[PDB]
Amino acid sequence: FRTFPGIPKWRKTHLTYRIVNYTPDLPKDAVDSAVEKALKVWEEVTPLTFSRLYEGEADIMISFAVREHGDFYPFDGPGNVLAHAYAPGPGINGDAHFDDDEQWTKDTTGTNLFLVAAHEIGHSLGLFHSANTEALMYPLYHSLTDLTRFRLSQDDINGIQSLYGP
Ligand SMILES: CC(C)C[C@H](CC(=O)NO)C(=O)N[C@@H](CC(C)C)C(=O)N[C@@H](Cc1ccccc1)C(N)=O
Numbered sequence: 001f002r003t004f005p006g007i008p009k010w011r012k013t014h015l016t017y018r019i020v021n022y023t024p025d026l027p028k029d030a031v032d033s034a035v036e037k038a039l040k041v042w043e044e045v046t047p048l049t050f051s052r053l054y055e056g057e058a059d060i061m062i063s064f065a066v067r068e069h070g071d072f073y074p075f076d077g078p079g080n081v082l083a084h085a086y087a088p089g090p091g092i093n094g095d096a097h098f099d100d101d102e103q104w105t106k107d108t109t110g111t112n113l114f115l116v117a118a119h120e121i122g123h124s125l126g127l128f129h130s131a132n133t134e135a136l137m138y139p140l141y142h143s144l145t146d147l148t149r150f151r152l153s154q155d156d157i158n159g160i161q162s163l164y165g166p
Pocket residue numbers: 073074076079080081082109110111115116119129136137138139140141142
């Protein structure tokens with residue numbers, strides 16, 4: 001497990017993400033919105049303030065890809081999960097690859113570029129793996145994607161209470 005205290009591998013409580021690429025299916029624009037939303041309430045919980053790439057490097061950068069790349073999770077094509085992501089520090093710091101195999105969709109999900117985002121974004125920092133109802137860890141895209149107040153994992157939130165160092 002990652003996270004805490006005084007935050008992960010960042011000396012800022014004002015971070016960023018970067019959709020390196022953005023597969024133009026949701027569209028690219030609604031894929032940015034799938035991510036950017038996820039981000040938004042992750043910044044209500046911790047003291048952090050996430051946003052898209054202010055400059056330089058980021059926290060969790062993401063590229064789309066996995067039509068069948070073969071990293072972690074499965075390139076399963078449109079439908080299923082999709083992110084074959086791995087941790088903050090390890091990978092292009094906070095690395096996640098989202099099935100460009102999909103045709104991003106939010107038809108309940110099918111696949112929506114939003115939870116690959118949540119799973120990734122929460123995965124990197126340290127709100128990484130649990131088992132609840134609403135959590136980023138509630139483990140199969142049919143989520144509580146009401147990202148107005150998504151209310152992340154309550155356990156992996158106890159790690160966002162670290163991000164929250166200040
Ligand atoms: C983003 C979050 C939802 C990821 C979860 C849980 C997780 O944290 N795994 O590490 C997941 O990977 N679930 C996969 C496991 C594996 C394939 C990587 C799954 O059950 N996927 C469904 C996809 C799905 C989606 C909608 C309807 C039906 C089925 C499946 N392959 O049966």
